[PDB]
């Protein structure tokens, strides 16, 4: 819902995953040029991984299941683990070095 419509309208292909709210779904439906009423009502209840490929790169708008990447390499940011760090016992600190 934040992307400029004049930019989203020029994208050839869309990979519509599950959208929960209503503004995003309306904004996506207003920027698609090959719509099937059977599939466009399926957006709020797509499984985690399913995609609805629509655009010029496919013969028909198809609902696919993207092949998962092999296990052992998946996108994962290394953000700090709050629960693991907070579960540890508190050791004495040296705040003089921090200064």
């Amino acid at each position: 819902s934040e992307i400029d419509s004049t930019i989203l309208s020029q994208c050839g292909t869309l990979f519509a995953l599950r959208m929960n709210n209503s503004s995003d779904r309306n904004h996506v439906l207003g920027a698609v040029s090959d719509s099937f009423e059977g599939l466009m009502g399926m957006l709020p209840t797509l499984r985690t991984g399913e995609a609805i490929i629509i655009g010029e790169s496919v013969r028909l708008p198809m609902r696919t299941i993207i092949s998962p990447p092999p296990f052992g390499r998946r996108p994962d940011s290394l953000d700090p683990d709050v629960t693991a760090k907070w579960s540890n016992n508190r050791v004495q600190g040296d705040y003089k070095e921090v200064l």
Partner: protein, 99 residues
């Protein structure tokens, strides 16, 4: 017996029998013999079908991926990038990611 082409020629009349599409018929529909199209996944109904997607239109025209953060869009993008940049099939890929 040529292929599946969009757009009908003569419309059905009253009393015409309605059947159900079987898996070979789905293969006929969602299949093509062009060398440009690349399989990215499987159709939701039956998993034996490959999801052929063109690659010239995907890059030259444009692309876009939209979905909620809980729908695992990162995994889909990672799988797409890994499939496009296969070393055995596409030894001269060129991709820049603005992570």
């Amino acid at each position: 017996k040529k292929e599946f082409e969009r757009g009908v020629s003569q419309y059905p009349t009253i009393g015409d029998k309605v059947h159900i599409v079987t898996e070979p018929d789905l293969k006929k529909i969602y299949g093509t013999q062009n060398k440009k199209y690349i399989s990215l996944g499987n159709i939701a109904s039956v998993d034996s079908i490959p999801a052929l997607v063109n690659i010239d239109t995907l890059v030259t025209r444009h692309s876009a991926v939209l979905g909620s953060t809980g729908s695992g869009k990162s995994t889909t993008v990672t799988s797409i990038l890994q499939r496009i940049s296969d070393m055995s099939q596409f030894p001269s890929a060129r991709i820049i990611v603005f992570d």
